[PDB]
Design a protein around this ligand. Structure first.
Ligand SMILES: N[C@@H](CCCC[NH3+])C(=O)O
Ligand SMILES: N[C@@H](CCCC[NH3+])C(=O)O
Ligand SMILES: N[C@@H](CCCC[NH3+])C(=O)O
Ligand SMILES: N[C@@H](CCCC[NH3+])C(=O)O
Ligand code: NA
Ligand code: NA
Ligand code: NA
Ligand code: NA
Ligand code: NA
Ligand code: NA
Ligand code: NA
Ligand code: NA
Ligand code: NA
Ligand code: NA
Lengths: 307, 307, 307, 307
């Protein structure tokens, strides 16, 4: 049902944690999803950008979606990231994700092998009939800005739930004034996006760390002092490209093992020490996990290319 | 041997033609490669952006490399596009591409899931030991400009042959002043890149149509009137994102079937009528194949999602 | 939980039905599983021999397991056939099947590339720790009889639920006298296996057609007149190798489309006419579906090699 | 060309050696192939039963074929084992194997999911049009004896080169009396098959160890004393199912690493000490490689499941 996707305000693009040889750590993963549920997260993107969907083989990506649905699907909406720059891969991944019971699909436009606007419509029309879909526009990553006129055309399909928008609040505004549901994809804009530009909520990286605070920010009104308390954390999280920050942070909080699939590599020690300061400034009680935050040594990290 | 790669001036990023069910049309592909050889192309990229490597599965990609090596490897350099945004997939694809006998690899930086400069170094160092490599910088497609300082760090690796650069002639000049071999990735700049800015040559889209003229442009001295006669054809080929133009043109020339793997769709008839006029203005004798060029109807083109 | 697998008496190796181009027909499949549930089937093997697991790619096999768990897993035990002649494929398929929530795994011994008894133990020990497992011995198909001493050793693992045994009642007896749970894999022996040789029940092909009668046979005592009423049907079902009969029968009853993935091909018209007679002799009210049984013409069947 | 296949008398089903992580050891593989060439082997089967095609993924299988073609295809016939119990996989694998340049295909009848004789015809006819083919009958592994009448139906297809027959010399004689080319698949029968029953030659396991002697056995006339000197080595190689023996022997000769992909495990030390004694009795100068033969300890062998 599309309405139940359009109602969600806090959707976590959840991190995918790894065992020391690079396989998925399902125990760590299930603990992360439980913590999100317990703090009032309402949806999860499985294998999004933050979840390193880009480094999974399809078999592990589908498995992670079916696993999430099977263990948690009665307590949180499960949105599979089954988009691709290849229409073939997007069709197969999407019908398989819905077949295993996911509630919605996140679809990016084709990245790297960008196409024409007419190719864009054709790509999205190949999958939009399969179930509730969120379209993801992030031109800083894909190389291509999905134009509003393509979204207005696609939003004729009742399966289109809305758009995860990264271009900025002026774009959010153009959609929401025209009746298209939008989730901000920029944590550091999502407060204003919510309260001033009609965004329904956020598809967040930062809620991997402080889900209770992100939920407060999306449900309890303007609170620019809470927003600006979170801004240093968000800036830290994006000092290098996502998910490098979140991968480093979750290892420091002891909820994830310090294992990276290449090409990502941890933030250096000076940044890690900054994170230890942010956690003390904001308060450890707001962060996921129970263990004391650690700086970690460089020697603690495992980088794997053959996963 | 890296020196043999360094010496190529004309490398064609060859188009991959399809059968109406979406599979590779190997007979048409062989004809295209033969045609390149008879016109003096010195290298092909197999499954590059132009060859839609992005739409292939790894098994069909490695197969096309091994097929290209087995049929043509004594007459042209075969450069497999075995890069990936995933280090795991880049390591596997590169190992297998070298095992079936390709002479070099083309490696892009990770697109879409972009990484830090440190991660980029880890990524390239995971494959550079395998054999002669060209690094590919096209930030308009990947979302990330590879900084010269990263290349300079890698360039003393004896396997780094040089860089396929799309940023422009000022970046070309910075690399060649610093002693890095550069191929221009922009057909509409490669003349000047070659004669004014020290590029060794071009990795070309336009040579799929006019290989003899592109060879002339890279070997015979500055020729600004040849260059400006090709410029309108070059603009036509990039009207929509490559390979939309080349896929359309080759179908009109009758050397490939009018079959598109999604998300690409053809140029519309008004552009296809311009292409007919360009062939006549430049001379059909310079274009690949021998069939009379056709305009084609929109209903000639088969758009396939489930390949 | 292993006990809940050991309790099941009627497990249907369910047929996998296809669309006209060879993809899975999930609508037809869901109707078959619903009919099994409604007639008191207690488990299903997903992608067994009968379900043509051997012709699926892994992605579709895992998908079918996760689909079955998600739609039906609260009303019937879902047993994935995640065995393989390759230990690698068996490990991956099995952990993925359990991750998507299947209740048990069916594991055959390595077929075609048969191994030593010591290789057999090693193969099974690679997967037995993952969850409740039924080991499948069918030497007429694999080329190798799993010996009782390998099963006695493996049955030290609390995850071993029991054995699907095809060698015959004397083998069933040897296991059941020693405390190992057995399901007969031979429909035409399963009555005697149940009542005289201690089998817990049957993993049945014939219950795809007459699930209510197979359930009666397994729960309601010796009834050799019911058994011998079913024998002509069972003999028909195995006139050619399974699943050729069941695929032809379900198409005749109108619950499946008449589409075969090669190398299977339908029974000829004279056999189909015999099936029409068996259905009238036993009574259409005992067979799955509501449509009148049809002979079908040869022209109605679709055989597909490129699925 | 089919006539060139028909003329080969000594074809080695080459072993695939592994690195300790489970990947192919291509350097050792090249040495083994070179050694076959220097001793007069005329064809190799790549990824046959002996080469563990059954444990490979299709991409590594097609890669090994293309690698074998690219490095050795001018000096030996390369016959890809591209058969499968799945017609879909046999069609794809065969197309790709021919595309990377193999000279012929080896096709087994569908094993485990066995089909009717009509289905078997449909299966073989789906791949026979692709190029020169040897059909492989080994009912002790597949569960199904291909009947001569099926081969006779297919043998007027100009692509059928002939049959690799494991049933025995009486079946060999029936085929050769009927004008079908036959290679013996049983090392311990191939002498008599060759000199008494009209076989053209052998597709051999034992030539992985003693290629020069096996060539002698097939080319130089009846030699019953050479034959009976090889018989004890041949018995040793089939003590457990092939390729357990050959994998053990090559490791002891030091031409491959002591690495096994599961489900195969090595022969125990008492057999490995017999192999040392056989090398000495026959003469090390006849065996592949030049390292002194070693017994090896059980703890030398790496058994890998997650390759
Ligand atoms: N690396 C590829 C494959 C990912 C497949 C699983 N999501 C991509 O980013 O498109
Ligand atoms: N569509 C994926 C996979 C391509 C794999 C073959 N080159 C990508 O662009 O990364
Ligand atoms: N045809 C192969 C692959 C099947 C994979 C899905 N069960 C086999 O029978 O082993
Ligand atoms: N294990 C499967 C797949 C092998 C695929 C590569 N030859 C089989 O024996 O059919
Ligand atoms: Na608002
Ligand atoms: Na807390
Ligand atoms: Na906490
Ligand atoms: Na010409
Ligand atoms: Na021409
Ligand atoms: Na009993
Ligand atoms: Na009924
Ligand atoms: Na019924
Ligand atoms: Na020697
Ligand atoms: Na030797």
């Amino acid at each position: 049902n599309t309405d139940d996707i359009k109602a969600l305000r806090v959707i976590t693009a959840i991190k995918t944690p790894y065992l020391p040889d690079g396989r998925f750590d399902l125990e760590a993963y299930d603990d992360l999803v439980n913590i999100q549920i317990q703090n009032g997260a309402e949806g999860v993107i499985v294998g999004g950008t933050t979840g390193e969907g880009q480094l999974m083989s399809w078999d592990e990506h589908i498995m992670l979606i079916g696993h999430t649905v099977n263990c948690f699907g009665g307590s949180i909406k499960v949105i599979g990231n089954t988009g691709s720059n290849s229409t073939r891969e997007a069709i197969h991944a999407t019908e398989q994700g819905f077949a295993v019971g996911m509630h919605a699909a996140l679809h990016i436009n084709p990245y790297y092998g960008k196409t024409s606007i007419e190719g864009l419509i054709a790509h999205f029309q190949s999958v939009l009939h399969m179930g509730p879909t969120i379209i993801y526009n992030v031109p800083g990553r894909t190389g291509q800005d999905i134009p509003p006129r393509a979204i207005f055309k696609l939003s004729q399909n009742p399966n289109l739930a809305g758009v995860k928008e990264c271009v900025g609040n002026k774009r959010v505004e153009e959609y929401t004034e025209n009746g298209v549901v939008v989730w901000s994809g920029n944590d550091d804009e999502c407060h204003d996006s919510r309260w001033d530009y009609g965004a329904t909520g956020v598809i967040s990286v930062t809620s991997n760390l402080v889900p209770g605070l992100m939920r407060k920010l999306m449900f309890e009104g303007r609170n620019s002092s809470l927003n600006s308390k979170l801004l240093p954390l968000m800036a830290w999280l994006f000092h290098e490209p996502n998910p490098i920050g979140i991968n480093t942070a979750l290892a420091q909080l002891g909820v994830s093992r310090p294992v990276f699939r290449l090409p990502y590599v941890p933030l250096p020690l000076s940044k890690r020490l900054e994170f230890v300061k942010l956690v003390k400034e904001i308060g450890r009680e707001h962060f996921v996990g129970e263990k004391d935050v650690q700086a970690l040594d460089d020697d603690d990290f495992i980088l794997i290319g053959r996963y």
